[PDB]
Design a protein around this ligand. Structure first.
Ligand code: NAP
Ligand code: X0V
Ligand code: CO
Ligand code: CO
Length: 159
C-alpha cells in the first residue's frame, strides 16, 4: 500500500521557503500516527527541511529521493528513483510537492489535512497534487486547532 500524506491550505499550498507557513499541532500527532512504523519516502528538499535533531523521524524507515549520485542522508536510505523507495507493505510519501506529484500514480490512498487559512498561491510555492475523478474521498468535520486555526481531514482512496 502506497499512500500520500500532506497538509494544505485550502489554496493547495503545502510549502514555501523550505518551510510550512503554519503550525497545526493536531496534524503532527495525526501525521505521526499514520506514518509510525512504516516506510516514509521524501524528496531531498523535504529531508533538508527537517532539523538534524529530528532526522530521521523515529520508528520509521526514512527514505530520501534524490538525483545526486552519492547523496548521503545520515540516518536514511537514499534512492534515485521512487520505485526503489516503494517496496514495503505500507509506504507513505511525505512530500514535497515534487515527490507527491511523482508518487500519485502509484498511490492508492491520500490522507489530506486542509487548513482553513487564507494562504494565496505564490510563485515558487510547493503545491499539493490535484486529485481527479478516480479519487473517492470522505470529508471530515471542521476541527479547531490548539493553534487557533480551523482544519478538516480528508481520506481519499481509489480501487
Ligand atoms: N505536508 C506538507 O505541507 C509538507 C510535507 C513535506 C514537505 N513540505 C514542503 O514542501 C517543500 C519542498 O517540496 P519541493 O517540491 O520543493 O522539493 P521535494 O519534492 O521535497 O524534493 C525535491 C527533490 O526531490 C528530488 N527529486 C525530485 N524528483 C526526483 C526524481 N524523479 N528522482 C529522484 N529524485 C527526485 C530532487 O532532489 P535533488 O535535488 O537531490 O535531485 C528534488 O530536488 C518544503 O517547503 C517543505 O516544507 C510540506
Ligand atoms: N518536524 C517535521 C517537519 C516536517 C515534516 C513533514 F512531514 F512535513 F515533512 C515532518 C516532521 N516530523
Ligand atoms: Co500504520
Ligand atoms: Co483499497
Amino acid at each position: 500500500m502506497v499512500g500520500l500524506i500532506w497538509a494544505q491550505a485550502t489554496s493547495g499550498v503545502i510549502g514555501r521557503g523550505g518551510d510550512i507557513p503554519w503550525r497545526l499541532p493536531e496534524d503532527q500527532a495525526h501525521f505521526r500516527e499514520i506514518t509510525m512504523g512504516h516506510t516514509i519516502v521524501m524528496g531531498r528538499r523535504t529531508w533538508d527541511s527537517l532539523p538534524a535533531k529530528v532526522r530521521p523521524l523515529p520508528g520509521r524507515r526514512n527514505v530520501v529521493l534524490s538525483r545526486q549520485a552519492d547523496f548521503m542522508a545520515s540516518g536514511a536510505e537514499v534512492v534515485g528513483s521512487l520505485e526503489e523507495a516503494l517496496t514495503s507493505p505500507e509506504t507513505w510519501v511525505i512530500g514535497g510537492g515534487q515527490v507527491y506529484a511523482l508518487a500519485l500514480p502509484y498511490a492508492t490512498r491520500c490522507e489530506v489535512t486542509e487548513v482553513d487559512i487564507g494562504l494565496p498561491r505564490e510563485a515558487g510555492d510547493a503545491l499539493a497534487p490535484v486529485l481527479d475523478e478516480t479519487w473517492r474521498g470522505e470529508t471530515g468535520e471542521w476541527r479547531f486547532s490548539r493553534s487557533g486555526l480551523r482544519y478538516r481531514l480528508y481520506s481519499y482512496h481509489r480501487s
